[PDB]
Amino acid sequence: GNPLVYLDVDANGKPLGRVVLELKADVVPKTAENFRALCTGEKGFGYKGSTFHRVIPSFMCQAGDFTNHNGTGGKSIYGSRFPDENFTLKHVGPGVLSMANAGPNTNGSQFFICTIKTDWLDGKHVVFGHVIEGMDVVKKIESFGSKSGRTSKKIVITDCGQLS
Ligand SMILES: NCCOCCNC(=O)[C@@H]1CCNC(=O)/C=C/C(=O)N2CCC[C@](Cc3ccccc3)(C2)C(=O)N[C@@H](Cc2ccc(-c3ccccc3)cc2)C(=O)NCc2ccccc2CC(=O)N1
């Protein structure tokens, strides 16, 4: 069974609802497990309390920098960084869940949820899941973004975890 995880998201303290994500452990098990564990917080750190720090309408919503909150930080469950597992899955459309990075083999904790097909990221960012519920919440997040990526409200992952 591919793991299912959830993000409960707020904007300036107001709940937006829940996003449920299927993690494709059947294709990218190491990357899926990193994200699963960062949702549960079982290593003592993870996504709870962190923000969507870069949100660009008609592109993607990026989150997961729980150390620096600005797109420079984070860490994986495997040490600071881990290599690109594979590029099997493509950025096919809205709801794709993929690893942010700073170049090859720089996966940590930062991730993004696409709101469009982002084919120019294929082969550069490791796709590892998909939204199965709460795409409307993703669109709410997107609506607080801007062309620069700066957000107009503080978008926080209030809670997160695994659904079992
Ligand atoms: N129809 C047209 C629609 O088209 C719109 C098109 N725009 C597009 O395609 C654009 C075009 C190209 N600009 C960009 O690369 C934008 C960059 C940007 O904002 N920086 C602000 C944040 C910092 C920087 C630079 C920096 C500084 C310190 C350390 C590392 C890098 C730059 C960054 O690079 N930080 C990573 C994120 C990350 C992830 C993991 C780590 C890590 C840390 C610790 C341990 C392990 C890992 C560090 C940083 C970033 O943010 N990566 C960019 C990115 C993130 C997510 C998805 C996709 C993209 C590509 C994109 O954004 N591509």
Side-chain angles (χ1 to χ4, degrees), residues 1-146 148-164:
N2 278 342
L4 304 184
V5 297
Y6 67 92
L7 309 176
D8 293 326
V9 185
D10 71 73
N12 290 349
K14 174 172 176 256
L16 302 184
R18 181 169 282 193
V19 185
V20 185
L21 303 151
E22 179 178 343
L23 306 183
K24 294 285 284 167
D26 52 8
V27 175
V28 278
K30 296 173 176 158
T31 308
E33 172 63 11
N34 181 68
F35 192 88
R36 189 202 63 77
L38 294 168
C39 286
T40 66
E42 59 193 72
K43 304 304 185 193
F45 51 84
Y47 298 134
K48 183 168 187 181
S50 58
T51 72
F52 278 83
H53 70 268
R54 180 162 172 254
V55 176
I56 294 170
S58 302
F59 182 24
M60 60 79 226
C61 310
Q62 182 180 350
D65 182 352
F66 53 73
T67 69
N68 293 338
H69 315 290
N70 62 12
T72 63
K75 54 168 167 183
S76 85
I77 68 168
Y78 309 118
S80 295
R81 332 190 136 198
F82 66 110
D84 298 313
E85 183 167 18
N86 62 60
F87 299 108
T88 293
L89 296 171
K90 303 317 191 177
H91 296 86
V92 293
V96 164
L97 173 64
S98 184
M99 289 305 283
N101 65 52
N105 302 311
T106 61
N107 299 288
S109 50
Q110 283 187 63
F111 66 96
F112 60 108
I113 301 172
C114 296
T115 55
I116 63 163
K117 170 167 173 284
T118 59
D119 48 275
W120 58 97
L121 305 183
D122 293 344
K124 292 173 199 270
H125 296 259
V126 175
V127 170
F128 66 97
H130 216 270
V131 170
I132 59 167
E133 163 71 11
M135 194 65 208
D136 298 345
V137 177
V138 177
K139 299 301 277 180
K140 289 176 218 203
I141 296 167
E142 181 187 31
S143 80
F144 297 119
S146 73
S148 61
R150 294 190 291 277
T151 58
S152 58
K153 300 191 189 280
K154 191 180 194 143
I155 306 308
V156 169
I157 295 165
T158 324
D159 194 29
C160 50
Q162 182 168 6
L163 299 178
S164 294

